[PDB]
């Protein structure tokens, strides 16, 4: 799981400072669970999004975790990312996490691809 | 058969900057993919909270969806990244994912 | 097994307009994918800068994420497009991509 990117959407409304802290902390979580250095970790966080999950528009979050190229790692990543949100008052079953792995030739960085 | 380019950045653009970006980046995609000019869906969200390499310096995330190959992906990465480096972004803070 | 519909538009919606849209579009996903609404995620972003066919006229982009066929995809496209055309969008400015 190299070059990971975590894209987050939530209907919660965060201050600018809350988002700055969130991208740091969620990025550090990604770095830790995937065993990748923080220098390649990308995090995007969009708040104030209209979200409905299970028919309810209560607080919820949608996340996609993308990376270059695992049952075990996915479970640890799901748990750790979900814990950041439950630590901030979200119900865990309203945290939707999807994983999108990619081949090196499908990842652009620094104007090139790693293939 | 029409590609889609989804763009997110923590940079803040004026309306004219957004208008020019979706036109120019859309035309880059059309040209590199061998599609007609304007035959592309482009979305651009600015002011997004972004962190890359631990830093909240200006950065951009792009997803390019086309119903692509190793060679075309490299040309697309270079051409899209050049647009951003020409507009003040660091080349190593541009992530492009191909689908 | 939990589908997600991600919507972006350059239209501007009120909070009440967004609430109604996520409800009705989510109900369409439930029906066309044959999944209970408890499994369906909908996100909606308005005020997005969009260009489609070279034009920044009112338009909507949708990505439907669900594990998996031509037949269901055709019905999904038709039903989701009808919601937008019933709510003031031009049909040829509705773009839907499927990600299995």
Numbering used by the authors:
A (entry chain A): 12 to 80, 83 to 128
B (entry chain B): 13 to 79, 82 to 113
C (entry chain C): 13 to 80, 83 to 114
Article excerpt on this structure:
T. vaginalis evades host immune responses by producing homologs of host proteins, including cytokines such as macrophage migration inhibitory factor. T. vaginalis macrophage migration inhibitory factor (TvMIF) helps to facilitate the survival of T. vaginalis during nutritional stress conditions, increases prostate cell proliferation and invasiveness, and induces inflammation-related cellular pathways, thus mimicking the ability of human MIF to increase inflammation and cell proliferation. Thus, TvMIF facilitates parasite survival during infection and binds to the human CD74 MIF receptor, triggering epithelial cell inflammation and proliferation pathways linked to the progression and pathogenesis of prostate cancer. The production, crystallization and three structures of N-terminally hexahistidine-tagged TvMIF (His-TvMIF) reveal a prototypical MIF trimer with a topology similar to that of the human homologs (hMIF-1 and hMIF-2).
